[PDB]
Symmetry: C3
Subunit: 131 residues, 3 copies
Amino acid sequence: AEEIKKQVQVNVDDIRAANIKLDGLGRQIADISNSISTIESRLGEMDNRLVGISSQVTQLSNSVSQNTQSISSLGDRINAVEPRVDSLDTVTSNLTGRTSTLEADVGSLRTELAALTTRVTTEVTRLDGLI
Amino acid sequence: AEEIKKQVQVNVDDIRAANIKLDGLGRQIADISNSISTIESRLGEMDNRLVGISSQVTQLSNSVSQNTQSISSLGDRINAVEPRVDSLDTVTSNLTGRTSTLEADVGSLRTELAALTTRVTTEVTRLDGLI
Amino acid sequence: EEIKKQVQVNVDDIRAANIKLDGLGRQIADISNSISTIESRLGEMDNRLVGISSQVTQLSNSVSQNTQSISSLGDRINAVEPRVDSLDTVTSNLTGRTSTLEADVGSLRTELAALTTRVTTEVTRLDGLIN
Ligand SMILES: [Cl-]
Ligand SMILES: [Cl-]
Ligand SMILES: [Cl-]
Ligand SMILES: [Cl-]
């Protein structure tokens, strides 16, 4: 029949349009599959960056721990030096005052020795004059 | 003719069902393309975040490097101070002994001069008596 | 006859298109699984960046404490050094004053011995003139 042949031909056409659509979707899918492989490789490149940064942070963490310890060692050394310098300031104050006292005492002894030298002359001259 | 007509309608229905299913698959693919765009935008935000993290790690590294150098300089300055304080301990210990010796010697000279002073008085009184 | 054959060809073509549709459906399901895994990897990456920044901030605070300690130690060594320089100078002046005292006391020692001998010489002489 005429109506039957016409519908059959419309179905042939519609099956062709559905196959065009299937071909288009297959290409969209293939391209997406390929693009996800590149995204996975972009993730790998970022993973590589993070491994290098983490390695640098761990190296810095070790350096900070060494420096915390070195600072503690320097602190023990300056802790120890300071009282030794305080003690030298005390000993030098002590010696300065004792040196000034010696210089006064030697000066007094020098003048007293000159007075006794003069006295021996005075008295010997006097006694000699009486003889 | 009858069987043909019935199968032609089954084909009309099956072609329409295939089209509806193809349209549903197209919408699933559009959703995946949207998921891909979001993933790419997350990766781009991570790249941008890495500019700040790299900058911060480098700033930290440089601060640690400066501190390592400061510790080295301070250690050299304490290494230089220590033997100077050891030297001053020696210098002041030897000066202390020389100051104590001078104090004993000046004390002895003072008492020896007092002995001679009285000897002069005694001998002059004696000689005066004989004249 | 021709119509009957074309209708069965359409049945065959619809069945082939349905195999392809079912295959594409499964390929889309697989791609959806790949996307879910990528989203999980992004979540892990996001936290790996948060973990690095957390560690860098913590380390920065430890470094700040060490920079502070270094400044403190630097203030202490800056203060100690001029005190040691001063002790070198003061002890050098005290040494010169001690050497001068030793020469002066030595001289007064010899002079006092000479005056002791002079008193003996002169008393013997005066006794000789009287007796
Ligand atoms: Cl290391
Ligand atoms: Cl972050
Ligand atoms: Cl950071
Ligand atoms: Cl006489």
